[PDB]
Amino acid sequence: AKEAVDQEINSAREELRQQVAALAVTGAEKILNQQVDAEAHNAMLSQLAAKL
Amino acid sequence: DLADAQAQVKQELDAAKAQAAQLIEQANRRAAQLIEEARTQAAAEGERIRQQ
């Protein structure tokens, strides 16, 4: 019985993180969408070429 | 001759007494697992206490 209780506690403890991360990524998606920096486009392609 | 035959009856009576012994052995041995099952349920009762 006690082990079952512990497992349920752990299940909730991990589960919450999933919706938290989903909210975080949705916010990140919104921020990137509002980001309209083709300057960053140029910078990052140059960065890769340097890594290339 | 008759008295000699008569002693033999006593042995049969003793055998019957021994036979009863098995009756009591079984009957009270049953009670052990009776208790076992009943307070096994009591363990289940601690369990749904834990579930509450």
Task: State how far the Cα of A19 lies from the Cα of A24, in Å rounded to an integer.
Answer: 9
Kindly identify which residue of chain A lies nearest to residue B52, measuring between CA atoms.
Answer: A5
- What would the DSSP string read from start to end of A7-36? HHHHHHHHHHHHHHHHHHHHHHHHHHHH--
- Name residues whose C-beta falls within 8 Å of residue A5's C-beta, 6 or more positions apart in sequence: B50
A1 touching B (Cβ < 8 Å): yes
Experimental method: cryo-EM
User: In this structure, what token pair is assigned to residue A41?
Assistant: 């486009």
- Chain B: closest CA distance from residue A9 (Å): 13
Task: State how far the Cα of B50 lies from the Cα of B32, in Å rounded to an integer.
Answer: 27
- Name residues whose C-beta falls within 8 Å of residue B47's C-beta, 6 or more positions apart in sequence: A1
A2 contacts B46? CB cut-off 8 A: no
Q: With breaks defined as C to next N over 2.5 Å, after which residues does chain A break?
A: none
Cβ proximity of B50 and A6 under 8 Å: no
- Name residues whose C-beta falls within 8 Å of residue A37's C-beta, 6 or more positions apart in sequence: none
Resolution of the structure in the document, Å = 4.3
User: In this structure, what token pair is assigned to residue B5?
Assistant: 């035959």
**Which residues of chain B neighbour A1 with C-beta distances below 8 Å?**
46-47, 50-51
Cβ proximity of A5 and B50 under 8 Å: yes
B10 touching A (Cβ < 8 Å): no
